[PDB]
Every structure is written in structure tokens, then in C-alpha cells.
Write a protein that binds this DNA or RNA. Structure first.
Ligand SMILES: Nc1nc2c(ncn2[C@@H]2O[C@H](COP(=O)(O)OP(=O)(O)OP(=O)(O)O)[C@@H](O)[C@H]2O)c(=O)[nH]1
Ligand SMILES: Nc1ncnc2c1ncn2[C@@H]1O[C@H](COP(=O)(O)OP(=O)(O)OP(=O)(O)O)[C@@H](O)[C@H]1O
Ligand SMILES: [Mg+2]
Ligand SMILES: [Mg+2]
Ligand SMILES: [Mg+2]
Ligand SMILES: [Mg+2]
Ligand SMILES: [Mg+2]
Lengths: 930, 937
DNA sequence: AGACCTTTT
RNA sequence: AAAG
């Protein structure tokens, strides 16, 4: 249809090119809108392209590309490894990535843009078959609603699925067949392709001598389909995620070092419930290898990983006394019947490790359930608001005090935000014209050279702008800070030492709150929950008990394997395969909470349909033998693509839940439990085969939830109280009755304070030192006077340019600033013996010359009060030099001229700031080195 | 006796001109007169009214024909003037040093040198009676070569009288002596201002006349302590002088005075809680708040009234009420706890984050003695030395390959925050930082590579040599799984005998393994010094959740016959720290020994037990009798304190003999260990041990009058016959010395010139000017020759100290200036007159550059020490590239507040080593959730 | 063959 | 300069 002819043609003159140039050569043709199946250019393969280490070399002279724009270039390390590294480098895989619907012409549905070559973390499938044989795209689903579409035909969804799954796709000399799809402004889904055949493929192992292999065979290698025909084919397709999961290959274990359990840990109450879903033990030696190959400073107590068909958490055996390598699996972890024979089905693959915990706070989503469970809902609301007002008042107060002393404000500006990542990537603080491009680095840059925010109004104004903006972000983003809270990986107690409703929490280091610190939790009640929390029982109050038996297990929370039901299931139906629990030991949050029982979930079979058709049932429609199994696999893919590309009712029903519970001000009434139970059965929609369409979502809303098809937005979604009377919902109350008035009071104070000759000014006699010293010379000279007059006028012309291009009002703002800065640097002695001393030519950077100091000093005096931004935008660099030189005092130490790189590697000494202000306040001798 | 004639006019004379003067100037006007040798009584005189309201010493001192020292810090001076000698706990100290005068004419025997006004942490007595009323001196001991003949003939008793029988007059004040302790060997003596011209029979210059006999009665309440031996009583005055941070004044109803210590459950009567009591969690929180601590301290070392010792948080305190308890073992005298200064918690130290310790020479003999396989123990300790050396050198050699990595390493090798805070800048000697670490980072921050510039290479070479030479001498073999930790008793009876509880306030790191507590392992506990074979004990670490709150402390059981602390060289829980080791390679071969059968040395150890009471029956009863007895106690105890200490001689003897015998467990070793154990407590326990007693003990039990030779390891090289067999000889000469020489050759081999075409670019710039200008050539020429004269002055093996010598040469270096050389437009551009710091002008750069060219190889230490600051400026100017960022000129103060960011180094080097797409280390790449995976599947 | 050690305010 |  329109879809046909969408893919780029491979010109038959690159048929010998390595696929690395072939991918990058096919990109330049696209971006430069040039056909490649034409003799118009007379193009032919330059053998110089093989052995290349830069894509730029390949791109470099002909008519059709002369002057056209260049596309983003793949980085050299990826290209080198692409050409000479067999697409793998240090556990990373070179990725063939691509990504849209704009011309409504009846005869190409999509505009395809190939994305550059790039490194990403490999997976089992790329480590077994080669990264070059995998290709991913981002394509918009036919089952979305926002209109960008021609959709406007009934069977388009089937047609789109037919294009991707029915047959092979030709690109870069390789035949790509689709094997997986999952959801990643329009909703776009990620589709994965495998290179089944190619030009350089042997019809029977380096990148260019790949034996032809079919997707049906690749998937049969991963899932061992013969022994898993009993599985529903939609769940079988979902297990392909385990093969695509970006994991760190750790080690390969031998069959005799693997303990396949046939039974899970079941409830001691005979209820049959599994108390260890997704969790197994590993040896202390295996954990040590995880540390060694990943570069960690400590043996991880627990890891999230995969191992053959097994998926979940693995935790150190506290009772491991030897140093023999081993690992165990359970049925709850094993997602398909696997023989664990190939070394890739026996490699421990780590997704992440349980690392040090940082404070989580209390996100607003939990407050309705915490309010539903408060023994006194009026005190809890009062306490949460008092906590918020105090935190806000503390934040605003701590800012104003730091402004009084420049060493203290430097801490604050450093603590407030973070530029390390930018400093590492640029090897320096990046500068826009004459100042750092960020406002935080500009404040610290200028204060490092002696400028005071309480004295220099340019600094006062910038510090004013950031606090205005922090205030404006605090009333769109509401944050209830709870120091004694963290998200922690959930682990089960294999050793039966934890009683029902007892939990073990030990930290790997000091967990700091303002007034207390912890290395473990003991003899206190804690609140555990999984986010999001829906049912009133989705948050549970339990007893933290520190068991010395488990002391070695750190940065995990351990739940009891006693009792009727595992605690992880009561937390929104969770388990121990990577789930994290919100853990709160803040007494003010815990002591009000009363536990609710698990609700009676309603029967929603009338609305929720499950397709449980097995691989066997899908295969018997084709017969028996290899070719039948091979066809059923391709069917499994196609039938699963319709389901994956279906609408996201999990998101729609969750947004309805938020609104329903808001307008009703209830999370425990019958509508809320029905909705919570519904979104619970929709988390696994693709996996457990839940077919749920708009019409089923229509009945349920009208029949069972209150009749409303569409519910209003909650008021807290707006940034101003558009409600009637005092807020009633707890979140509305916290945003508009507590936070908003408090933020406003500081903003009012800000303008009122902004409104005396006693204050911060633009003028600084230090900054005009060079202007005056020359005037003394110029007034007694003729030559100096001419240079001075020419320079002063020259600065004026650039100031005029700044006003038109940057101040008053196309080309982007940084580019305009740079254009004026180019003219600013252009002011020079050459354009008008003294000239040599000012120029200092032996210096490569003209900006480091004395001329630049005089140019800055002269521009300052002439424009410090009419055009302040112009002087600092162009010459703050030299203004800071002048300030540091002028403020130096003989015998009072020595200023230091840091290089750009060495500067970016320094940070404020927190212990210096505290200790220095202490000495100034007369507390000269207090307790040392803490 | 005359000494007595030379003990007349010792203290400076107080004229009538300064009678009105405040103690602050009267002290410091006296100081200058003495330094410049101008008599206070010179008629060749009016008080300056300006001096009374002065806030700076230079104003005092500038106010004259005769005048052509160290100045009291300007803040301390204001406190002495207007803050009543007391600024936020710190006290202004009146100090002085006395030496024997070379003049042998029987003129003053001692030469006084009043030390400048300074700040020190106050104490109970200064806070109660005023810091102005206390004077402290260092005086030579009269019981000591170099001793003057007048003292050598006849003298000790004549000096002691001069100190104790009368008041001495200084700065308008009459000072009586009240305490003395051992600081030629010198003794520290403390005085109390009993009267003065300004005194009357509160303000500093309006002080009621108070006597030493009463000052001591307030502190010790002597009426209720006549039963104590008067020497022990005198030693308790040190509790009133302990430099302490006053935390809070507790009320009487909050103080629980226990009357019976915790005793052994076996009926032996042994005390299991000596020096240790409990405190409320609230009291601990105020300690945190008053001292500015980040966390709540579990345990503290302090004093409360008559109580001295450790106070630990009560783990059962669920309330918010402030309370403290005292025990008999803590209370050093009968106290009523009525005055608020006798009810104030005073803290000397708080239990804090522990650091890894090192093995010491004292512990190794005992460790070998108790080893079941000595060969294994030796191999392990040596192997620990060889691998510890190998890491140190490998960590540094790698670090030298990148300036950002070596700056990180230098910053981590030494912490200079205190000197930075103290000065508000990095202290500079001439044109480079004082410290070597700070010199390296200063030059690296301006663009110098420590592997390309030889001057930096030589500094790091010299610095690593000094540490290696220290490891040769000390053998402080670092052991990661070890630390010194305050000892505490288990009030709650959950620990069994030989079970200890150790929990850390944070992660304690040892290479591969890290710990927040100790559990299920054996540990070694020992107190330094270790002498007896029983002075180290193998015990079991058991973590008890009931004691989880107590951190950075080691808890011992209160069950069992004898407290484990007592088995550690007779230690207790009043401040004692234990060497704690959980290294399996060190712990698992140790076999405990029973406490030693100490021999009777009463024959030579004479214990004066005279009580205050018997000392007073020579006077009768009543206040006048008490006052006399208290002044008797001072004089008699000064006699005992000023007496020679033989612990150094007897410990040095035990070392030399036990080395000869290679045994710390035979009869002479038990004898000498028992002897040194009594000598440490001599002043408190009143044991007289004369030279004759040491002579008699040596001749009857220990080898006689023979002077024992020094052990081999006291020498740098093995001059011994054969192969080293003593474990210290073995480790220093067979292990350390060869391994250090091998790691050193590798270090140098890995490591580069003094020349730098950038550092000589200003020289070249004016070389091209001086050719087309005879005037510029004259300046240029004059400047060159001026530089050489300074270099000659710098250079040879000098009574003046090294910094003073360098500063002198530096001042003639800065003297070079554009003095007349005729084109003024140029002289001004070089001069940069507007700048106040002349070392910031363009001339100082050229002076540095020109010096560099004429002397990069010749005398290299000259140009760097003088002009290294300007050499750094030229480097950072030259190495700047257009558009590649901006160099930064940072003030001295702001520079001292920055530090290297470990996370920047690790991220930058990882990004640069190609391998930056691997696992995100949480400590390098930090709702609080970090890395949870690379994708979604 | 010649007068202690340890780690911190 | 302390403390053990
Ligand atoms: N080697 C050595 N050890 C010392 C020295 N001074 C004190 N010690 C040690 O400190 C111990 C004294 O402990 P303290 O806490 O001061 O006092 P105490 O023995 O408990 O006695 P009380 O003050 O009555 O509780 C003994 C020694 O082990 C010294 O100069 N050298
Ligand atoms: N008979 C069955 N009927 C329905 N679902 C089943 C059946 N047997 C197993 N399952 C499903 O198999 C899935 C395998 O668990 P899996 O680890 O994939 O889920 P999860 O713990 O929710 O995942 P994650 O926390 O890693 O996002 C479960 O969701 C479970 O419901
Ligand atoms: Mg699971
Ligand atoms: Mg899960
Ligand atoms: Mg004691
Ligand atoms: Mg005692
Ligand atoms: Mg003690």
C-alpha cells in the first residue's frame, strides 16, 4: 500500500562495503536528500572507506552533496569497534537504531530516519548471535488517538502489523525479520529485528561471515519451544524480554554448580502460598565475582539478574562457609522450561546491584491511603502541613543567611544544584562569551575572585533570579521531605528467623537524618509500601527487628517467610524479583497508621477477557514437525504484535482512578476497590493475555463506578486555586492552603527587600582601575590618547550591537551573544612599544592579555549603570581578574590562577566553611576533626 | 645554700607608670621592653591614655629613640581587653618560659621570657575564678648535664621554697603556686593571683582577694577529704585544670549518685564499671548541639564535679528528661555538687568515627610470645609490610601519570584544613606555599605536570623518602582491620565473659571487605603500653541488638571474676582506649595467657601514705590549721613532683634487657614489667623510688650496674653479627629495609626537566624589546645582576631559623623593583601602581621569567621559592587556549576553601580511559533511587 | 654501652 | 599543648 517502498534501497555499488560504512553511507544520502540508485553522480565504492576510523573521512566533494547539511556523526570509538571490534567492546554492543508519519499523498506512509551507530549495554541475544544481527526501530502505533493521520481505513492496524511480521525487510544488505515489540505527542512502540540473511551471509564467526539463521530458530534457542508448548503463546512471547534485557555478563557456572529446586518456599500454614517469589540464594564467592567484574568497592548483598530462564533477585547465603561457586533457582524464578546447557543459558547476567540508599521522601500519591489509615485524620493532616511549612521556612531562611557571607553562599550555590556532569563532559566549566553559561557557575566564578553578592548588584540580581525560579518550581512540584524513608530492594528470609510482620533492615553505611543516624533499624515500627499504593492495605505497618543472623545482608529489606501470605503480595501484589519497597521509619508518619485487611476483589470477568490459547493449540492448526513449529513461532509473533500495539488501558484507568478517588475523597469505598482491582489485573495485560477494549471500559464506568465516562481534573493539577472555598482534598490543602501562601510570603519579601544607598550597587572602584591608570598616561601623552579614544568609541559600537541583537529582540540567543563577543574580541590594538606590552603576543589566548583587562575596565566605567549585562556578558572574565588583582594584599597570602580544567575539578570544602565561620564567631576552639 | 642570692630579682619589675595599666598592656608593654632590653625602671614616664582603649598590639608597640617579637593574635588581645579573658570557652593564657641563665655570677639564676597572649581551652577553675587569675610557667627541673654549678653544689629544696613559700610579683599581681607536673627536662608550674594593686578585700580588674588555700578548698572540699593521702589529693587538682568544653549545668534532682559500683557476680568484689556511668539521651543531644557535632555521641570522656571518666548513653532511656549518674569509682573526692561549676558536665573528648590503626613495636614481642607458631606470625606481619608498601607505591606511581589524579592523591595524603582555617588562606613561605603538599597542588592547579617538571618531581620524591624513612624507624605496619576505641562497660548484663560488642557509626573500610559492626569473629584487645604477656587478650565479638545505639565504642562484659579492662595493663573505663584487631591473619594464632604473678618490689618501692589529717595534726584544728596544711601539701607534693622520674629509665632498661634475652616472659621481664606498672602512677600513688632504689634493684635482681647496649633496631643499618633473629630486627632489616629500597628504585625508574619554554616567555618578550632599546636593556641588565646577589645570599651549613633566613632573602628579592629605565610609559605598565600587591604586577612576572632563564639548572630551589607564585601565573596564562574555557584568578581566601572532587576525578579518568560505559559505581555517579538497570526489560 | 610509649584537643 |  502506501507502506511499500518506505525502506531505503541499498545501492548495488556498496555490495562489498562493511555494514558500518553501509549504515553511515545510507544515512548521509537520506539527510542530504540524494538518491543512490542513479547513475547521475557516477558514484562508486572508494576502497579508502574500509580501514577508516572516522565517519567524517567517509562523508568527505560531489555535486549532489556539495553544501548540504551534515547529519550527527557516530562517535569514533563506536565506529572503530564497529569496523574492527566485531560490534562488541567491553560488554557494550554497537546498536543499529532507527526511528514518523507529513505529506498526505496516496502513493510512503512513514518517513524513516536511521539513527547513528551507538554503544549500549549488550544482552544475552547480542552476546550469543552478534550485535550486528539486531536492529531496533521506534514507530507510532496505529491505535493511538492524537491526530498527526491519513487511520482517518478500518484495517490499518492489521495492515501495519502485516508489514512488520509477514515477511523480511531489506536494509544495509541484510534481511531483517521482526521478533519482538513493546511500548516505549504520539505513542510509539519499539520493534526489534533480527538479520536472518544477507549479502555476506553464508548459506550453511565474524560479522562479515554470518551463517544464515532464522528468527524461529533464534527464538527456539532462547525459549526451547519444544518443552514449552504448554505455555500461553502471549506469555511465551513476553519471555523474549529476558533475552533482550541489557545485562552485565558476570560469570558462567557449571551444571554441577546449579541447584534447581523443584518446590518454592511455601507458607508454614499449609496455605500453599509462595513466600520466596523471584528470590534465590547465591554463594559468597559468586557475589565476590560480581564485585570484581563490575568494579564495586564492596561485595553486594543482593543483585537483580537473570540466569537461563530464571529471573529475579539473588542474595548471599549467610550460611555459606566455603568458597565454592554455586547458585540456586526456584520455580517462581524460572519463566520457561530450560535445560541450562549452552553457556549463555548458564551465565549469571546482572541488571543492577543493591547499592547505598538515599532518602526518598513521601510522594503525594501515598497520602490518600495514609489518610485513610490514620487513627485521627485531623491530626495527621495538621502534622503533614506543619512539616511542610517548617521545611519551606527552613529552606528560605537557610538561603538568606548564606548570602551574608560569600564563603557560605558558595556552599549553598554548590549544594543547590550540580554541574559536575557538565564539567566532566567539557573538561571545564563551559563559558558563553565572557561568563559561564549557567547562573550557578557564574556566581561561584565571580565570588571566587572576590565579588560579594551583598555588594555587587549583578550578583545580587542573579542570586535573586535563581531563588525566584526555585520558588516557581516548588509550587508546581510539591515534595514532602521525610529523611527517615528510602526505597529498598525486597528480599525474603530464607532462614526462618523473622516472625510474621517482622522485617530486617541493615545499611551498608551511615544513613543520615538531620538529628539521627542509622546503620540499621531496630525496635521501631516502620511503614512498608510499593508505589503506587491503591488499596487501603497497600501500605503495611510492621516491626523492624535486627537479626544478627542476617547482619551481613545490607541495603535490602528482608520480609518474613512465615505467615499465611507473603508480605510482598500485600504490597499491591508484589514479590521479590526486583521490587522495591517504600520503607519509612519516621515516627511522626508511622505511629498514626492502622493496618487494613486485604480487600475482597470483585469479579470483573464480564469486562476482562483472557486469551489463554497455548503454543500447542496454535501449532495444531499447522500440524507437527519442524516446519509447523517454525510457522507457529511466526504466528506467535504476529498475534502478539496486535496485542502489544493495543491501547494503554492501564494508563487511562489509572488516571480515572486518581480522579474518581479525588472527587469522592475516598480510596476505600466500593468504586475505589473495583478500580484498584482493575488496574491491578492490567499491569500484566500483554503477559497474562487480558483483552480489554474501549467498550468494556465503557460498561464498567457506567455500570459500576458511578456513571461518569469523563471526570474532571483534580484542582492540584493547576498552579492556582481555582476551587470554591477552602480546599478539602489533602493534596489540594497541602499545595494551596500550606505551600502556596508560604512561598508567596517569601516572594512578597523578595520584592519588598528589593525596594537606600546602603546596599548592593553595580559600581566598583576596583573594576575601573585600568581605565584610570591609562587616563593618567593618556592625558600626558598623544599616542596613548589616540589609542584610548579609538578603543572607547570601538567599545561603544559593540555595546550598540548588543542592544539590537541581544537586549531588545530569530537566530538563537547564545549565537547572538557570540556574534557580539566576536566583535568584542575584535577590538584589539592592531585595529586600534606600549602596543606590544598590551598585546602580549607570546600568549595564544588574547583574552589573557593586558589589553583585555583595559578593554574590560574601560567598558565597565562607560556602561556599568546603563548597560550592566553587556559589560559582564562580554568581560566578566576580565572583571574577575581585575577584582582578584586589586583585592590582593601584601603579606595576606597569594591569589592563584587556575587553569580551566583544574578549576572544574575543585569543590567547596564543607568542613572549611563550617570551621571558618566558627572561628569568626569567636568559637575558635571547638571539637576538632568530626 | 646560696642559689638564694640568684633567686631574688627573677620576675620583671612592675613600675609605678603601669599601675593604672590594664593587665593586657601591662603584660605586653613588659614583653617588648624585655625583648628590646629596655629597663621598665629607666628614668632616662607616662602611661599612654591611647593604650587603655587600644585593640591592636602594634598601636601599643609603635608608641622611643632606643627602639630601632611575636605579636599576640589580634582577636585574643581584644578578649583580654574587653571580653574578660574569656571568648566562648577559650581562655586567654598568661604563660612564660624560664631557662638557666649562662651568667654564672652569684645576678638572676633564671631568665624569664613572657610568652605572647594566646587562646587555650578553659577549665573549671578558670571559669570559676577567672582566667586572669592564673599563671603558667615552664621551669627547668632542679633534680636533673648542662646544669649550672650553683645548682649542682648543695639547691632543690632552695628552689622549691622559692616557688612555694611566698607570692611572686608579676604584672601588678601576687601569684602563689598550687600545682606542678612534668612538661633539660622541664616542669610546669601553675600560679593563682591571690592579690594585686587593683584587687580588693565580678570584673577582671576588680577581683576580691582570694587565697590558694581557699581556691583549693572550693575545688576539693578538704574538710570532707582529710582521710585521703595528701599526694593523691594534690593530684586531683589536675581535674580542675583539665581543658574541657562546658556543656550544661544539671540540677540536683537530675543527678543520680550511686553509692556502690557494679561488682562481679562471683562475689570477688572486683569493680566491673570503673570510671564508667550512664547519661540520658537528651544530655547526649546537648553535647551534640553545644559542640556542633553531626550525630549524637554514644559516649564521652569528661568530668562532673568530683567525677572523672566515661559517660555512655542509657539504651533504656525512652524519656526526654535530662539526667546523669555518678559511681564511686568515678568520684575522686567527697563532693556536695552544690556550686553550678561543680554540677557542670565538662567534656574533654567524644567517641568519634574510628580510623585504621598500625602495629607498634610494643605489641609485637607479646604477639610473638603468645603465638602458637612464631614462624607463621613473623611471615604474616612481614608479608603485611611488603604488600602495604606495594599498594602505597602503586597507588602513587599510577597517580603521578595524571595531574588530576596526583592532586587527588596529594590532597588525600595530608589534611591541611586546620592551617587553612587558622590563616584564612594557604600559608606561604616567600613565593611558594609553606607545605610541600600545598606547593605541589598550587603548581599543578596552574598547569604544571609532576612528570614533566622536575621541580615537582623532586618534591614528591623527597616526600615519599621521608615517609619511607619513618616506616624504617617506627615499623607502624598499617592493619586495616584494627582501630583504637574507647572502652565501656555493659551496664545491662547482656554480654558474657570474653564477649565484646563493637558497632560502628558508619562504614569502616578495609580494601575488599567493609563493616558496620563486628559479629561472629574473634578479636584481640590490648591497651598501650603492652608489657606483660597477658596485656593482649583474645575475645569473641558478639553483636547485641540491645546495645545497637552505642557506636564507635567497645563494650566489655560486667560478668566474670575480673574486668577485662583490668587485664589490659590494669586499665579501666574512664577514658582508656583499646587497640582492637579483627584481622584473621593476626588474631587466629594468638593464645591467651593468665594475668602475671607479680613479684614483691616493696623493698625498693616506698609508698608515702600520709593523709591530710596526719599532715594537719602538726597544726591542730580550725581554719588556720587547714590553711597551713594545704600550703604544706603544695610544698611537699612539689618536692615529690620535681623528683626524678625513673619510668623512662626503667622502661628503656626493660626494652634493652628483654631484647638481649629475646624474652618478654622470663623472670627479669616479669620483674621489669611489674616495676614500670607502679612507676606510671607514682605521683598519684605516692611511691618514692630513688636512684639508690633503682641501683639496689638492678644489682639484686637485674644485671647490676652494667649499662645495657641499645638494640640493633635503634640503628639505621644492621651492624649485628649474623642474620636478624629478633622480630623487630627481622622486620626492619630483613623485611622493611630491602622492600623500601626495591619500591624506591621502581618509583624513580617510572618517573622530566627544569626547563619550560613557557616560563621563559616574558624573558624572551623583553629580550626582543631590550635589543631595540638601550634603556630597556639597562633595566633588563640591572634586573639580571640584582637577581644573582639574592641567589648568593640564599646559599651552606646559621643561628637564625630557616623561615627567617628565607624571608630575609625574599625581602631583598621583592626589593628588586623598577627603581632608576627612562621610558616612563613602559615603567608604569610594568609597575601597575594601582595594585596594592606589587607581586601582582607585570614586573614581578618578568622578574620571575628572567630569573628562570638565568637559573633553571643552577640553584633551582632559588627561583621557585622566590618566584614560584609568578611562575604559576605565567604557566596558566601560557597554557590557556582560545575558546577552550577560561582560567580563573582566585583570591587566597577563596582558594583555601576549595578541595578536589573525587567524583570529578573518577568520572573524568573513566571517560578518558575509554571504559566509561560500564557499571555505574554508586559512590562515583551519585525518589532517591539510583541505578536500577540500563533498560526496561 | 646513658631519662617511656600511644593517639588526639 | 593535650589525653590515656
Ligand atoms: N606509657 C605511659 N602511659 C601513661 C602515661 N601517663 C598515663 N599513662 C597510662 O594511663 C594510665 C592511667 O589512667 P588514668 O585514666 O589517667 O588514671 P587511672 O589509673 O585510671 O586512675 P584514676 O585517675 O584514679 O582513675 C596508666 C598508663 O597506662 C605516660 O606518661 N606514659
Ligand atoms: N497459571 C498462571 N496464570 C496466570 N499468570 C501466571 C500463571 N503462572 C504464572 N503466571 C505469571 O507469571 C508471571 C511471572 O512473574 P514475573 O516475574 O514476570 O512478574 P513480576 O514479578 O510482576 O515482574 P517485575 O516485578 O520484574 O516487573 C507472573 O506475573 C505470574 O502472574
Ligand atoms: Mg516473580
Ligand atoms: Mg516483581
Ligand atoms: Mg579510673
Ligand atoms: Mg583511682
Ligand atoms: Mg584509666
Amino acid at each position: 500500500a502506501r507502506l511499500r517502498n518506505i525502506w531505503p534501497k541499498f545501492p548495488k555499488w556498496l555490495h562489498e562495503a562493511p555494514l558500518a560504512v553501509a549504515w553511515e553511507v545510507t544515512r548521509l544520502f537520506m539527510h542530504c536528500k540524494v538518491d543512490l540508485e542513479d547513475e547521475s553522480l557516477g558514484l562508486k565504492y572508494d576502497p579508502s572507506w574500509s580501514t577508516a576510523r572516522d565517519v567524517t573521512d567517509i562523508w568527505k566533494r560531489l555535486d549532489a552533496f556539495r553544501g548540504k547539511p551534515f547529519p550527527e556523526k557516530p562517535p569514533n570509538d563506536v565506529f572503530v569497534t564497529a569496523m574492527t571490534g566485531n560490534f562488541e567492546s567491553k560488554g557494550s554492543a554497537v546498536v543499529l537504531s532507527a526511528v514518523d508519519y507529513p505529506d498526505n499523498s496516496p502513493t510512503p506512509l512513514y518517513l524513516v530516519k536511521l539513527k547513528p551507530l551507538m554503544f549500549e549495554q549488550g544482552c544475552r541475544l547480542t552476546r550469543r548471535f552478534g550485535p550486528d544481527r539486531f536492529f531496533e526501530i521506534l514507530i507510532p502505533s496505529p491505535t493511538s488517538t492524537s491526530p498527526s493521520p491519513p487511520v482517518s481505513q478500518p484495517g490499518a492496524v492489521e495492515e501495519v502489523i502485516q508489514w512488520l511480521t509477514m515477511g523480511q525487510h531489506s536494509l544495509v544488505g541484510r534481511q531483517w525479520r521482526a521478533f519482538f515489540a513493546k511500548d516505549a505527542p504520539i505513542i510509539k512502540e519499539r520493534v526489534h529485528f533480527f538479520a536472518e540473511t544477507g549479502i555476506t551471509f553464508r548459506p550453511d564467526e565474524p560479522v562479515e561471515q554470518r551463517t544464515e539463521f532464522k528468527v524461529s530458530q533464534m527464538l527456539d534457542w532462547l525459549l526451547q519451544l519444544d518443552n514449552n508448548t504448554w505455555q500461553p503463546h502471549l506469555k511465551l512471547f513476553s519471555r523474549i524480554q529476558l533475552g533482550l534485557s541489557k545485562t552485565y555478563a558476570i560469570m558462567t557456572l557449571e551444571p554441577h554448580q546449579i541447584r534447581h529446586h523443584k518446590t518454592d518456599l511455601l507458607s508454614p500454614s499449609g496455605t500453599g502460598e509462595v513466600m520466596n517469589d523471584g528470590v534465590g540464594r547465591m554463594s559468597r564467592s559468586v557475589a565476590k565475582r560480581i564485585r570484581d567484574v563490575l568494579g564495586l568497592g564492596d561485595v553486594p548483598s543482593a543483585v537483580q539478574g537473570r540466569f537461563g530462564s530464571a529471573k529475579g533477585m539473588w542474595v548471599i547465603d549467610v550460611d555459606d562457609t566455603g568458597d565454592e561457586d554455586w547458585i540456586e533457582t526456584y520455580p517462581s524464578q524460572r519463566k520457561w522450561e530450560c535445560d541450562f546447557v549452552d553457556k549463555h543459558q548458564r551465565t549469571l547476567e546482572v541488571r543492577s546491584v543493591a547499592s547505598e540508599l538515599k532518602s526518598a521522601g513521601l510522594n503525594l500519591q501515598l497520602l490518600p491511603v495514609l489518610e485513610d489509615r490514620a487513627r485521627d485524620k485531623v491530626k495527621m493532616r495538621q502534622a503533614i502541613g506543619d512539616r511542610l511549612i517548617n521545611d519551606l521556612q527552613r529552606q528560605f531562611s537557610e538561603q538568606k543567611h548564606a548570602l551574608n557571607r560569600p564563603v557560605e553562599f558558595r556552599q549553598w550555590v554548590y549544594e543547590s544544584y550540580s554541574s559536575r556532569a557538565t564539567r566532566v563532559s567539557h573538561g571545564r566549566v563551559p563559558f558563553l562569551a565572557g561568563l559561564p553559561d549557567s547562573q550557578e557557575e557564574t556566581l561561584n566564578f565571580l565570588m571566587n575572585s572576590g565579588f560579594d553578592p551583598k555588594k555587587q548588584k549583578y550578583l545580587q540580581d542573579i542570586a535573586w533570579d535563581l531563588q525566584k525560579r526555585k520558588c516557581d518550581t516548588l509550587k508546581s512540584k510539591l515534595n514532602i521531605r521525610v529523611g527517615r524513608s528510602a526505597y529498598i530492594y525486597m528480599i525474603a528470609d530464607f532462614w526462618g528467623v523473622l516472625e510474621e510482620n517482622e522485617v530486617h533492615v541493615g545499611f551498608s553505611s551511615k544513613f543520615r537524618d538531620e538529628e539521627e543516624s542509622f546503620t540499621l533499624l531496630s525496635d521501631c515500627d516502620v511503614l512498608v509500601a510499593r508505589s503506587p499504593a491503591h488499596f487501603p492495605s497497600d501500605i503495611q505497618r510492621v516491626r523492624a527487628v535486627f537479626k544478627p543472623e542476617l547482619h551481613s545482608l545490607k541495603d535490602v529489606i528482608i520480609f518474613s517467610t512465615k505467615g499465611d501470605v507473603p508480605l510482598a503480595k500485600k504490597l499491591s501484589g508484589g514479590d521479590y524479583d526486583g521490587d522495591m519497597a517504600w520503607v519509612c521509619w519516621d515516627p511522626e508518619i508511622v505511629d498514626g497508621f492502622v493496618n487494613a485487611e486485604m480487600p475482597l476483589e470483585p469479579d470483573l470477568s464480564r469486562y476482562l477477557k483472557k486469551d489463554k490459547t497455548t503454543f500447542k493449540q496454535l501449532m495444531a492448526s499447522h500440524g507437527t514437525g519442524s516446519a509447523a513449529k517454525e510457522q507457529t513461532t511466526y504466528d506467535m509473533i504476529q498475534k502478539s504484535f496486535h496485542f502489544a500495539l493495543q491501547p494503554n488501558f492501564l494508563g487511562m484507568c489509572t488516571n480515572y482512578k486518581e480522579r474518581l478517588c479525588y472527587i469522592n475523597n475516598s480510596v476505600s469505598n466500593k468504586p475505589a476497590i473495583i478500580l484498584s482491582s482493575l488496574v491491578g489485573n492490567l499491569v500484566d495485560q500483554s503477559k497474562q493475555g487480558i483483552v480489554f477494549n474501549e467498550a468494556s471500559w465503557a460498561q464498567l464506568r457506567r455500570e459500576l463506578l458511578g456513571g461518569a465516562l469523563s471526570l474532571p481534573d483534580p484542582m492540584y493539577k493547576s498552579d492556582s486555586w481555582l476551587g470554591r472555598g477552602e480546599p478539602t482534598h489533602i493534596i489540594d490543602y497541602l499545595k494551596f492552603s500550606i505551600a502556596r501562601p508560604a512561598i508567596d510570603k517569601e516572594l512578597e519579601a523578595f520584592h519588598n527587600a528589593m525596594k537606600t544607598e546602603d546596599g548592593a550597587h553595580f559600581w566598583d572602584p576596583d573594576l575601573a582601575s585600568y581605565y584610570t591608570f591609562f587616563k593618567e598616561i593618556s592625558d600626558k601623552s598623544r599616542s596613548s590618547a589616540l589609542l584610548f579614544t579609538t578603543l572607547k568609541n570601538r567599545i561603544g559600537e559593540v555595546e550598540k550591537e548588543y542592544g539590537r541583537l541581544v537586549k531588545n529582540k530569530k537566530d538563537p540567543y547564545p549565537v547572538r551573544v557570540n556574534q557580539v563577543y566576536e566583535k568584542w574580541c575584535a577590538i584589539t590594538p592592531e585595529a586600534m612599544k606600549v602596543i606590544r606590552l598590551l598585546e602580549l603576543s607570546f600568549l595564544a589566548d588574547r583574552e589573557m592579555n593586558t589589553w583585555a583587562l583595559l578593554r574590560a575596565s574601560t567598558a565597565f566605567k562607560l556602561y556599568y549603570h546603563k548597560s550592566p549585562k553587556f559589560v559582564w556578558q562580554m568581560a566578566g572574565r576580565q572583571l574577575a581578574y581585575i577584582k582578584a588583582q586589586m583585592t590582593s594584599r601584601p603579606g595576606e597570602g597569594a591569589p592563584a590562577l587556575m587553569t580551566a580544567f583544574m578549576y572544574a575539578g575543585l569543590m567547596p570544602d564543607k568542613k572549611f566553611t563550617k570551621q571558618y565561620v566558627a572561628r569568626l564567631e569567636g568559637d575558635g576552639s571547638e571539637y576538632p576533626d568530626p
